[PDB]
Amino acid sequence: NLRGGAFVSNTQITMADKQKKFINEIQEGDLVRSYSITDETFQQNAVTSIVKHEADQLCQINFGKQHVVCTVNHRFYDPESKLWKSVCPHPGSGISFLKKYDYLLSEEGEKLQITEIKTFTTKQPVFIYHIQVENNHNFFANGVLAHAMQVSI
Amino acid sequence: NLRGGAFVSNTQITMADKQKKFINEIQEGDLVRSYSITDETFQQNAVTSIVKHEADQLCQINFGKQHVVCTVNHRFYDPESKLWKSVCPHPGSGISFLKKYDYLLSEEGEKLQITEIKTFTTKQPVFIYHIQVENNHNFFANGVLAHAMQ
Ligand SMILES: [Zn+2]
Ligand SMILES: [Zn+2]
């Protein structure tokens, strides 16, 4: 399902060695760059699941010229306010609103400001992907910290 | 739960006789004004359920000076594009985005343009309510057509 949201196929995932791979090429057992919010350290972790879905509703989040495209309900870490945030959080989920001028955390641990957010509907449904990542349950999508799908959700 | 969304306690519901009652005063068996999209006719229908929740995340949808305050995932009928819409539709739900300059359907069948939408977080959780309405599964909240929890 799409309860944790999903990224478009050409979203780049930061591998453990800081190489970049498209999410649609990710496989179970792939080692990705991940982050433990308490230690404030970067750790490698295996992908334990990768699933392909479809949807026609997406949001583009700009941070400078760089951007990420995902379902409106994907969660991103704001390292300024130290909160997990989404453009469209479910009420009672405990996830905060993600808005223009909020911050994302880069794969090098820097605060990147969000300069623009837009929602749009594609003519046809496009392929989207969600992954599970052991231990830290997060990864870097186009260089910013995003939350991985969880079973406990 | 809050999958269908909910309205704040001081949301006015149009009764069958076109009187207004606060959603927090609504009772099972109350007859409310409702709408069948196919017939394009107004019908009376009984509330079958009313539940009180809490949340601190809300959006305000303005249509002129009037507005409605609900969870971001509440569905409203746009009579211009003839689609059910939400500020924050769940992906794959088949609900379209509701945005500034879209349209709402008044309790008298008139298209009212949305002039502003904003999301905010309250200091403390507030009480919010969803209802079930037989047959048409909709009602008028501050005079605009809204979907009832299916
Ligand atoms: Zn899934
Ligand atoms: Zn409920």
UniProtKB/TrEMBL annotation, chain B:
Name the domain of life. Eukaryota
Q: Which residues form the signal peptide?
A: none
Which residues are involved in binding Ca(2+)?
Answer: 67
Binding positions for Zn(2+)? 1, 53, 130
Family affiliation: Belongs to the Arg-specific ADP-ribosyltransferase family.
- Identification of the protein by name: NAD(P)(+)--arginine ADP-ribosyltransferase
The taxonomy runs: Eukaryota, Sar, Alveolata, Ciliophora, Intramacronucleata
